[PDB]
């Protein structure tokens, strides 16, 4: 069974913390965390979720406060049963870091047409609203299957 879920993207400040907390609210019987493939190179480790990501989630009663961006590592992947990436291209970048994690890595937006969810970083609130919408729809579908 998939009990520990890791939501993965690039910076671990916008989509992946949002997906973590949206999914955590829908799946209180699971442990959900998140990480970024390039959090360290982006100089983001320890940073909170983007303020606009927090605000958009808060308007939907999802708490993205007290987040700290962390880097995706092979050791981290071993702690989770299921990994959900925001873009299909993230899978190959992830398996470069943790080739053993291929089998448990799936797409966050699998159930909404296997769609990528684009990064809203450094764009207007509209982009964060769009990202939240896709994350919400995608997470609702995952919650019924885990």
Numbering used by the authors: 1 to 146
What did the published study say regarding this structure?
Protein tyrosine phosphorylation regulates the production of capsular polysaccharide, an essential virulence factor of the deadly pathogen Vibrio vulnificus. The process requires the protein tyrosine kinase Wzc and its cognate phosphatase Wzb, both of which are largely uncharacterized. VvWzb belongs to the low-molecular-weight protein tyrosine phosphatase (LMWPTP) family.
In the presence of benzylphosphonate, a compound that mimics the phenylphosphate moiety of the substrate phosphotyrosine, VvWzb and VvWzbC9A crystallized in space groups P1 and P212121, respectively. However, only phosphate ions were identified in VvWzbC9A structure, judged by the unambiguous electron density. The source of the phosphate ion was not defined, presumably from benzylphosphonate degradation or contamination. Mutating Cys9 to an alanine residue that has a short and uncharged side chain allowed the phosphate ion to burry deeper in the active site than the phosphonate moiety of benzylphosphonate. As a result, the hydrogen bonds between the phosphate ion and the P-loop residues are generally shorter than those observed in VvWzb-benzylphosphonate, suggesting a stronger binding. The phosphate ion does not interact directly with the D- and W-loop residues; however, the conformations of these loops are similar to those observed in VvWzb-benzylphosphonate complex, suggesting that the phosphate ion alone is sufficient to induce the conformational changes of the D- and W-loops.
